[PDB]
Enzyme design. Structure first.
Site, PDB file in Angstrom:
ATOM      1  N   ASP A   1     -11.533 -10.998  -0.788  1.00 46.08           N
ATOM      2  CA  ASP A   1     -12.647 -10.324  -0.156  1.00 46.08           C
ATOM      3  C   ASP A   1     -12.844  -8.963  -0.837  1.00 46.08           C
ATOM      4  O   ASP A   1     -11.878  -8.219  -1.030  1.00 46.08           O
ATOM      5  CB  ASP A   1     -12.338 -10.142   1.323  1.00 46.08           C
TER       6      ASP A   1
ATOM      7  N   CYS B   1     -22.280 -18.248  -2.533  1.00 51.33           N
ATOM      8  CA  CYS B   1     -21.247 -17.420  -1.900  1.00 51.33           C
ATOM      9  C   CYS B   1     -21.794 -17.067  -0.523  1.00 51.33           C
ATOM     10  O   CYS B   1     -22.208 -18.027   0.184  1.00 51.33           O
ATOM     11  CB  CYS B   1     -20.829 -16.199  -2.743  1.00 51.33           C
ATOM     12  N   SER B   2     -21.788 -15.780  -0.117  1.00 50.72           N
ATOM     13  CA  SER B   2     -22.500 -15.345   1.083  1.00 50.72           C
ATOM     14  C   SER B   2     -23.951 -14.964   0.799  1.00 50.72           C
ATOM     15  O   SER B   2     -24.859 -15.593   1.288  1.00 50.72           O
ATOM     16  CB  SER B   2     -21.769 -14.227   1.819  1.00 50.72           C
ATOM     17  N   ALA B   3     -24.167 -13.961  -0.042  1.00 52.54           N
ATOM     18  CA  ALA B   3     -25.543 -13.588  -0.380  1.00 52.54           C
ATOM     19  C   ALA B   3     -26.119 -14.365  -1.577  1.00 52.54           C
ATOM     20  O   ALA B   3     -27.324 -14.359  -1.788  1.00 52.54           O
ATOM     21  CB  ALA B   3     -25.658 -12.082  -0.613  1.00 52.54           C
ATOM     22  N   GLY B   4     -25.270 -15.032  -2.357  1.00 52.51           N
ATOM     23  CA  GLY B   4     -25.741 -15.820  -3.490  1.00 52.51           C
ATOM     24  C   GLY B   4     -26.032 -15.042  -4.760  1.00 52.51           C
ATOM     25  O   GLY B   4     -26.812 -15.518  -5.594  1.00 52.51           O
ATOM     26  N   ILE B   5     -25.443 -13.853  -4.916  1.00 54.26           N
ATOM     27  CA  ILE B   5     -25.640 -13.099  -6.150  1.00 54.26           C
ATOM     28  C   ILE B   5     -24.344 -12.586  -6.800  1.00 54.26           C
ATOM     29  O   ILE B   5     -24.290 -12.489  -8.024  1.00 54.26           O
ATOM     30  CB  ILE B   5     -26.634 -11.903  -5.977  1.00 54.26           C
ATOM     31  N   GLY B   6     -23.317 -12.251  -6.014  1.00 57.57           N
ATOM     32  CA  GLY B   6     -22.135 -11.610  -6.576  1.00 57.57           C
ATOM     33  C   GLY B   6     -21.184 -12.622  -7.193  1.00 57.57           C
ATOM     34  O   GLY B   6     -21.146 -12.823  -8.424  1.00 57.57           O
ATOM     35  N   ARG B   7     -20.402 -13.297  -6.362  1.00 60.59           N
ATOM     36  CA  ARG B   7     -19.511 -14.324  -6.912  1.00 60.59           C
ATOM     37  C   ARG B   7     -20.333 -15.425  -7.572  1.00 60.59           C
ATOM     38  O   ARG B   7     -19.923 -16.012  -8.586  1.00 60.59           O
ATOM     39  CB  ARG B   7     -18.660 -14.940  -5.809  1.00 60.59           C
TER      40      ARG B   7
END
Length: 281
Positions: free
Chosen positions: A174, A208-214
Site C-alpha cells: 500500500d 488497480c483502485s483508480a486505474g492509473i498508478g499500479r
C-alpha cells in the site's frame, strides 16, 4: 534552465487537447472513484447494449491503451477497480471486448480502505452479474499472486462458455512499490504466456483502485518487455517517451515517483537476467 524545462513540459502536455466530458457528467458521479481521475472521451470504453435515453448508461471509467510508438503487440484496457455500482458494468466490458485475461494489481481492501469490490464468486460457486453468469473454477496461489480460473457465459446461453484467467497480485505494498521486481516480472511472464496462447483474445484488462498508478506501471513494464522480446535486448528503450505515449491515452498513467523508479528497476532486472540466461556456459 527553468524556462526551457517549463516549455518542454507544456509542449508535452495533452490533457488540454482531449476532453473528458463523459466522465465529468453528473449522471456518472457514482461510477468514479475520484472525480478528477477520468477517461479521455477519445479512448474510453463504450458499454454496448445500453439505452441512450438513460443518461450516462454507456459509461465505464476505463480506456483502451495501445503501444502507439509501434506501427498499428498485445492491447490493454486500463480500468478503475469496481465499485458496488459498477461490477455489472465491468463484466459487460469484459464480455463485449472478448477479454480473456484480467490483471488485478490490488487486494480488495488494503488496511483498511476499499480498493476494489470483488466481482467473482468463491471457488466452486456461480453468480449472476447483469446478463452474465460467472463461475469460479479454481484458485491457484503463489507467494506474490493468485490465478483464479473463471468461466463466463450469458445467463440465457449456458452452452456458450468463455474461460477467463484472473491474475491477482497480492503483495504490492500500500502506498509504495515492491522492494524487488522479481514477483512482478514472474506475474507478467505468466500473463503473457496465457494471452499469447489465445490469438483471438481481446485486450488484457488491467486495474488497480483508480486505474492509473499500479495499472500504468504494470502496462508500461509489460510494453517495454514486449518491445525487448520482439525487437531484441539492445533495442532502444525510452521509458519517458513510453510513459508520455500512455498518458496521452489515459491521464496520469504512472502516477508516483516510486512507480517511475520501479519501472527502471524492473526493466534493468529483466534485461540482466535475460542476458545471464543466454550466457550460461
Amino acid at each position: 534552465g527553468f524556462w526551457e524545462e517549463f516549455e518542454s513540459l507544456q509542449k508535452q502536455e495533452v490533457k488540454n487537447l482531449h476532453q473528458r466530458l463523459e466522465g465529468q457528467r453528473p449522471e456518472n458521479k457514482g461510477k468514479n472513484r475520484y472525480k478528477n481521475i477520468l477517461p479521455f472521451d477519445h479512448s474510453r470504453v463504450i458499454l454496448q447494449g445500453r439505452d441512450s435515453n438513460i443518461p450516462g448508461s454507456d459509461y465505464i471509467n476505463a480506456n483502451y491503451i495501445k503501444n502507439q510508438l509501434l506501427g498499428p503487440a498485445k492491447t490493454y484496457i486500463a480500468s478503475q477497480g469496481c465499485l458496488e455500482a459498477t461490477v455489472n458494468d465491468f463484466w459487460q466490458m469484459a464480455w463485449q471486448e472478448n477479454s480473456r485475461v484480467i490483471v488485478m494489481t490490488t487486494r480488495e481492501v488494503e488496511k483498511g480502505r476499499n480498493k476494489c469490490v470483488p466481482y467473482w464468486p468463491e471457488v466452486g460457486m456461480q453468480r449472476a452479474y447483469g446478463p452474465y453468469s460467472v463461475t469460479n473454477c479454481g484458485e491457484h496461489d503463489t507467494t506474490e499472486y493468485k490465478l483464479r480460473t473463471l468461466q463466463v457465459s450469458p445467463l440465457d446461453n449456458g452452452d456458450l462458455i468463455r474461460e477467463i484467467w484472473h491474475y491477482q497480485y497480492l503483495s504490492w505494498p500500500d502506498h509504495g512499490v515492491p522492494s524487488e521486481p522479481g514477483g512482478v516480472l514472474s506475474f507478467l511472464d505468466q500473463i503473457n504466456q496465457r494471452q499469447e496462447s489465445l490469438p483471438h483474445a481481446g485486450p488484457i484488462i488491467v486495474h488497480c483502485s483508480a486505474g492509473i498508478g499500479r495499472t500504468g506501471t504494470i502496462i508500461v513494464i509489460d510494453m517495454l518487455m514486449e518491445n525487448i522480446s520482439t525487437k531484441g535486448l539492445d533495442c532502444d528503450i525510452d521509458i519517458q517517451k513510453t510513459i508520455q505515449m500512455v498518458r496521452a491515452q489515459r491521464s496520469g498513467m504512472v502516477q508516483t515517483e516510486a512507480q517511475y523508479k520501479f519501472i527502471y528497476v524492473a526493466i534493468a532486472q529483466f534485461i540482466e537476467t535475460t542476458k545471464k540466461k543466454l550466457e550460461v556456459l
